[PDB]
Structures are given as structure tokens and as C-alpha cells.
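Repro case for the chain-ordering regression, as requested:
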Amino acid sequence: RWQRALWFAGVVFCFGISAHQIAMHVLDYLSEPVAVRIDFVAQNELRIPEITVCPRIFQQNTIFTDMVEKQGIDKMKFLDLIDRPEYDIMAVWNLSRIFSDNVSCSAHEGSSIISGSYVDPNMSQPHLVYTTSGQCINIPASRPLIYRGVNTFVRITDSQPRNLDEVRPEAIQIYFHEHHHAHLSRYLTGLRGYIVPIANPFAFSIRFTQINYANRTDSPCVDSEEYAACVEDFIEQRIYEKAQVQCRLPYMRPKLPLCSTPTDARKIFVATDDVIQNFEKESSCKRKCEENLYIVEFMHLFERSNISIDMSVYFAYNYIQVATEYLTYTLRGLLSDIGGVLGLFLGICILSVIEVFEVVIF
Amino acid sequence: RWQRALWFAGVVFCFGISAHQIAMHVLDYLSEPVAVRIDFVAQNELRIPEITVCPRIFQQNTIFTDMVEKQGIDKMKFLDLIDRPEYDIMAVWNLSRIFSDNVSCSAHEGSSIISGSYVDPNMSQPHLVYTTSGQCINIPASRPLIYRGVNTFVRITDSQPRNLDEVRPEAIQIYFHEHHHAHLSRYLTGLRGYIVPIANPFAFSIRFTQINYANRTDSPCVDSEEYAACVEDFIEQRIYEKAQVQCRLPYMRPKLPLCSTPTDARKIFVATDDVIQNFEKESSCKRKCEENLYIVEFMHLFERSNISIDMSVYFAYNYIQVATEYLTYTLRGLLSDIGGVLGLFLGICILSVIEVFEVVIF
Amino acid sequence: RWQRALWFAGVVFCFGISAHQIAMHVLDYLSEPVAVRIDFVAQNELRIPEITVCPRIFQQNTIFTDMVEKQGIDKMKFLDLIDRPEYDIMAVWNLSRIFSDNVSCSAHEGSSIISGSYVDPNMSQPHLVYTTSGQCINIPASRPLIYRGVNTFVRITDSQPRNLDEVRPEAIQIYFHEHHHAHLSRYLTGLRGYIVPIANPFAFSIRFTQINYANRTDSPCVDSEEYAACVEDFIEQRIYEKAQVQCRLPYMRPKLPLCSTPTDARKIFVATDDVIQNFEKESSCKRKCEENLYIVEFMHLFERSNISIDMSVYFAYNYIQVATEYLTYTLRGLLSDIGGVLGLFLGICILSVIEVFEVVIF
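-- result from build under test --
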């Protein structure tokens, strides 16, 4: 009657409400949330980002646009050089070289009260690499620099004749990146790189900022190497099935031969443009787990020296800011919260339920 | 006796202690706490901050101080020009114009392997606006720029005759802001702006940093439009009831006529000084819970071109860091914690209390 | 039998499992965790850091290396000047002076619509100080600046004759720090300082970033004064018991007399080099509680002025970022979690246990 019906109403209310927090909690766990922890890691071992230094983009490299303009053709159709036998595609892209074999890079990873900074030229030296911007110089930047103050930098230097033998380069295309399945150097140096002058001995300063992501079903991060493989493979696949040529330009993996004819080379170069401009959206592999960010500011520093190209890249801050996305609702939290909901919207305990089941079997 | 007295002591202890966590928890909820969560949003659509570009402040604009010094008066009392019929307040503030109708602004929101960057001059063009610093040029900067690398900028240019027709401006007052009820442009450009030289084609770089606040009773936020309206209304109200003049200068809203007499104009201009210097404290409206911060650093980049004013504003980082203040102790947390306190400092449950009340009515 | 044995099994399961969360919780509390909370404090009263401005390190001060070269002694063995009576160690380091009596510093902590910025030259003036780099100029930088916009800076100026009387200094060693037991100024200015040129009126910009650490048994922070005392005492102790000289150079506390002989002075100077290079690792007192970080960027700003040394230091951002490490598992959390574990892996409550003890004593 009255009392039993009201007891039934109370029990149904408690169960239904206790079925509205457990159901919501399980739905929350299924669509797992993610919070962000930000830390400031002070490390006395800074990992130099790989530096790709290119000319301007062929048509703006007023080294290449001069030699090409000497052969009866002009920048715009610079790729027609391949028509005549004595010019091949590799020669054309060597024609944009603005560096000179003696390109060095020292590591000034400290200072002293005598003899100023501590010079260390033993770090991996630059090597030439073919990029869509021409023939660039890539700094391996293999080992990490010991952070011994704000005067901790890498000085890249080139000493080609600075006299009136030819028009001299005005700009260079810097690009800071990471290693291995080279597409950052070979494709994206023209786009993501800073165009800076070389009239004066410039200086960069770089702060590091890592953005770690949480690997989860609805947004799976893939470590850097496989992301680079995804991006480069997609880029070349779209480049080949966009001109049907089945050939490569000097900035592409040695998969198929170098088609030495302007028409074919023109198709590949234009397809390269189209793909690299918008490879971000039509790719499939999502962001990396680790997302390094080099906040590159400009500093005046030291003073000048008479030399062709001087580039001091400073790392005056050792506090690499890390921002990590993480799973904030692991299963243990779900179990504990379900226990809490049952225990504070009902009378059920775990030992209570086990004893009830024991009584079930008597 | 012993047993019952000690049982009473235990029950009173449990209740009083269970009345010291629930009371403290409710006090904590009343004085709501606020925690800060920081995220790094990578957006490929960056919203340009509106740019107000002024001369130096009348007395430092060595365009205005030259024309005014030609009429028998000097900078300091430049506002006496109104005394003679042929000069009005609008003429005086047009006299400080350092720009030239052909002031343009292009949006270079990418690059290419051929044809360098992607020029897009269709974005909203600058318009002249009267500010306390003279007659400035405001870049509407309406639509957002697609972030296609570090070479994503807005190049504002002016090409007035760079020859010996008159003394030329040495520097300009930049100011990065937002839109609508214009007070940032018209009042605070002299104070909050970067004074940078125009001798060489300079370049800015802007990082974005949003600071969102939690709208709460003890610290309520008013969105950007309402904050701007509050601030500007207070500024002009205090400006008018500081000289009793009931007239305006060209940087004020068209409410009352223009101050066509030096004395009156001087009173309004000094009152503007006093108000804008310390309007932050004497206002009443508190901060916005959207608080955009433009970290403006300087970057060398590209090269020079023969042109009067060249200002490239770069947005080379697309990771807008957002620091959001939020309510960390919502009512649900209070209820759950009260339940926990009762259940682990007492024997009371929710279904238990419901059954007890049922027994109350039997 | 069956049912009692199964009840015993269930009770043992609940207790042991309830002994695997309470034990884990207590172990977690013992090795206390620490989370980082980050806030963006908008401070309208900025505490400018102390600035030590030195020449380059003796051997690069082409003021000192010129005067020494005039006495038949060359840079590298500049410390042999002590051999003759006319030169003592104090004179040798007064000989590296690149500043001149009238070294002033103004505080431009605002702007106005008339008369440009608000000049406040009353703030504490620089004083000369003996450092390992020679005789530097230290800015007391005592009181804080009122942040009245982007144009809030400290302008340090020196107006020594800028004519052909002697070879002029070309760059200087800046260093931003804090106060009291001076070792940052006297030892670490050569190492941690920015080498920037003085050919043109340069400008710095300082963003503040505090990193507060949580004082805890496994990593105890010490206030700034105590850390400075630790570092300086260790540095001087290692310096003295590295040459056995029992004498000091002008950059050391007035404990023992000055080394008036080249051999002794050279031993101290090399010992200072060795200690300051690697005092970070062989010290004992760990990091400070507060860790102020001055993100030092460069700006072009205002314009040029004819003066020997001009150094504007701008504080254009008032949002001092703070990252505080804190104890996230205080004892109250441990007690509450133990209560939860008992209540949802058992039937035990606090009032339940108190009543059980009541029954025990009857």
C-alpha cells in the first residue's frame, strides 16, 4: 500500500539516478577526455634542429637566373636548358649552387674568461642536397650542444669569393627540422623556410617548444619517422599520378630515372608545386605524437666579420616548454567513480555484493 | 552509562567532523575557485590584429612641426592655428598627414616553387582615421589569412615621393588591436603603440596568446564590444566634464561640434591627456574574458625596396596558446564530495536516508 | 564448509584488495607527486632585473688590449703588468674601463600626447663594479616601473667622447640578474651575458617567466639569497683551494689581500675560469624556489641618437607568466582516498569503526 509503494518509488529513484551517473560516466570513458600538462624542462643538453639552407627559388636566385639568362632563355622557362645535350637536369640544379665546397659549421657551446667562446668544429659538417629550391646545404646537426650560457650557438660559415666575379646572392632560405626520410629538406624548404639576407652576418635565436599528443582511437598520433614516410610517400605518389611521366627531378627519391626533357620536367615541377602547396589536407596520416616548435627570433649580438655567409644560430634558453596531452579518465577512475556513485546513491558495496552473492549460493 | 555515553560521544564526534567538511566544502563552493588550463591550438586560419599606423605625437611628427612652424607659431602651441579663419581643427589634424592616398596592403599567405609568394591585394584596404596622434591610417584587416608557412604575412606599403620636397617622417607609431567601437585607434594609439623607424623596410612578427577568464560573480567579464563601449564612454564622459566645454576634437565621436578656438581645443586636448593616461584605474568595467595578446618581435627577413613606408607583419607561428580560467568546483562536485564525506565519516547514504524517511511515515 | 569457506575467501579478497589500494596510496603519498599550474599574471608594476654591463673579457676589450699593448705586454699575458711598481691589480682592472663618470639611466615608464614619453631619471643610478670581465657598470634597478603601455623602458646612456682619441669599444657584455650576495655580477657576467654591439643605439625587450618549484624532501628549493650564498661561497672556496695562494683578484670578496704578483694573479684567474665554467654540477645547493627567466628579444624601435652607448631595455608585456610546481597529493587526499577504498571495497566506515570499538569496550 502507501508505505511499500513509496519504498518502491524510492528504490526506483535511487537506481535510475544511480543509472544516470554510471551511464554518463561510461559514455565519458568511451569518448575519453584529454587534459594538457605544461612543464618547463631545463636541460643542459640541447638538440640542434637540422638546418637546410637553400638559395631563393630558382627564379629568384640571382645566381641561377644569371647563368640561365646567358643561354638564350630566361627565368620562367629555366627548365628548357635540358633541351640541348650539354645540359642535363642535374647540371641545371647544380647551376643554382650559391655555396662553395669550404662550407663549415662550428659549435660555440660555452665561453671562457680567456679566449672568449669555446670553438668546437668537430660536429657533423654540412652536405649538399637537392631540393625544390635548387642545390641546398644541409647541416646534419647530429650531436647535442651543452648549454653553457646564452653564448651557446652554432656558427655556419661559407667563404666563397666576395668579389666582382659574378652577381652575388642576396637572400637564403633557412629551414629548421628533424631527420631521416628527407622530405622536409627536399620538398618543404622553400615553403617553411625563413628568407633572410646574407649582406651582413645575421644571427638567429631559437626557443624550443614540444607539443606532445595523446595516442587515442579517435585521434591517433604516429611517431615522427612514420609521419615523414606517410607524407613523402603521398607527395611522390601524387606527383607521379599527376603527370603520368614516370620520372623524377633531382629532389625526389631515386625510384625512376631522370627524364631529361623540358616538357616532362615541367610537368613534374608543376605537379610538385600543386602537391606541396596542399599536401597537408589531402594526406591521411595525422599529426605526430611529438610536435617540436622552434620559436625563431632575431638577435643582433656580437659584431660583423668580412665573409660571404655567416649564420650564428643561438640557443640562449634551455627551458624547453613541453605541453603534453594525456588521458584524464583512465579505467581506474571510472571504476572508482562508479563505486562512489553506487555507495552514495545506494547502499551497495563490493564486499556487500560479494556477500549477497554468497547468500545466493547460501 | 559507559557504553551509551561513549556511543553518544562517537556519534557527536562523527557528526561534528562531518559538519566540518560539508561546511568547508560549501564555503569553498560559495567562494568559487578557478583553475587555469592552457592549450596550444594549431589553426590554419589566423585572424590579423587590426593595425593603426600613426605619426609620432604631433609635437614629434617632423611633418606637422614643420608646417606649423611656418605660420609664426611653434610646436607646443600648435593648436593656436585655429585662431586664424583659414585654419580649422580638421585642417590642423590633416596637416599631420604623413601618408598618401596610394596606401596599399597585400596579403602574402603562402609561397610557391615558381612565382615566389602568393600576392593577394584584395583584402580590405587602409582608411584614414583621426587619432590623438594626428591623422593615422587604419588597416581593416577583416578576413583571416591561411597559414601556409612562416612566409605568411601582410605587407603594408605607402609610396609617397621620397625626394627633397619636405622633411620626411623618421618613425611611425604602430598599434595592434581589435574592432568596432573605435577607442583603441582613436585614443590609445599614441600610448600603446610601437614607435619604429621607416628609414628601412622593417618587419614585425606577431605571436598570438589568448587569455580567457571565467565569468563569475566576484570577477565578471564583459565581452570585447561591451568593454570597448564602457571604456570609450567613460573616457569621453570624463573628457567633457573636465573642461565643461561641450565640444570635441577630431578623434572624438560626432556628439557635439568641433572646438574651433585654441583655448577650448587646448582644454579638450589636455583633458584627453589626463584621462587616457589613467583610464585603467578610474574606469569601472573589469577585464575582458577574451584577452588577446600579440607578442610582437622583430625579424630581419627578405630585403629592401625603394618605397616610402614598407611594413611586413609576419605570422610565422600558428600555435595560438590559450590560457582559460575555469570554474573547478561546480555544484556537482560539491554534491559528490558531500556524499563522500557523509559516507566515510558516517553511515548515511541517499537510499538510506530515503528509506529512513519512508519509515518516518512508516 | 562450502558457504563459510567461500565467505572467508570473499573477505580475504576484499581485505587484500583493500590492502592494495591503501598501500599504493600511502606509497604514492610517501613519494609525493608534483603537478605544474601555469598562470598569466598581469602586473602593472614590473620589477626590472638588475643589469651588469661589462666590456668583453680583457682579451677582447680593444681598450684594455690597446693600453696593455703599449707597455711591451700583449693581450694573453695582460696580467704581467703587475711586475712593475707603477701597476697594481686594481689599476690593471681600472684600465679596462670603457665607461665614463657620466653614465646615467632614465626610466621612461609611460607616454603622453604632449612631450612624448615620461622621463624619470631619479631611479637608482649605475655604479662601477669589479668583475672577471674587468670594471663593469651595474644598474641598481631598485624600484619597479609602472607599466603604462608598450613604451615602458629603462634607457641607460653613456656619453664619453665619440671622437678619434682612442680605439673605441665595439661591443659590450650585458647580463640580467637579481640582487645581494653579488656573484652574478662579479663572476658570471662574462658567461651568461649577451655580447651586443654599441655602434648604434640598440634596444632589448624582456619578457618575464617565473618557474616556482615545490619545496619537498626529495628536491628542496632554497630562497634566492641562500642559493646565491651557496654558489658564491663554493666558488671562492674552490678558487682558493685550487692555487693555495690565499689572495684574491678584484672580483672577489674582500677576505684576503690582493695578489700583487703576476704568477699568483694568473693562478687565481685560471682557477676562477675552471670553477665558473663548471660550478653548476660540483655545487651542492639545488635550484631556487623562484626561477626568474628573462626572455631577451631584440627590437628596432624609436630611432637613432648621437651618443657613445645607448641601451634601451623595453618591457612591452606585463603578463608575467608563472609556472608553479605544487604538491598534488597532500595528506588530506590520502585520508579521503583511503576512506573511499575502504567504503567501496569493504563495508567499513569511520562511525562504523568507532561503534565497533564502542562495543569492544562495552
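Ordering looks correct now. The longest strand of chain B covers residues 203-212.
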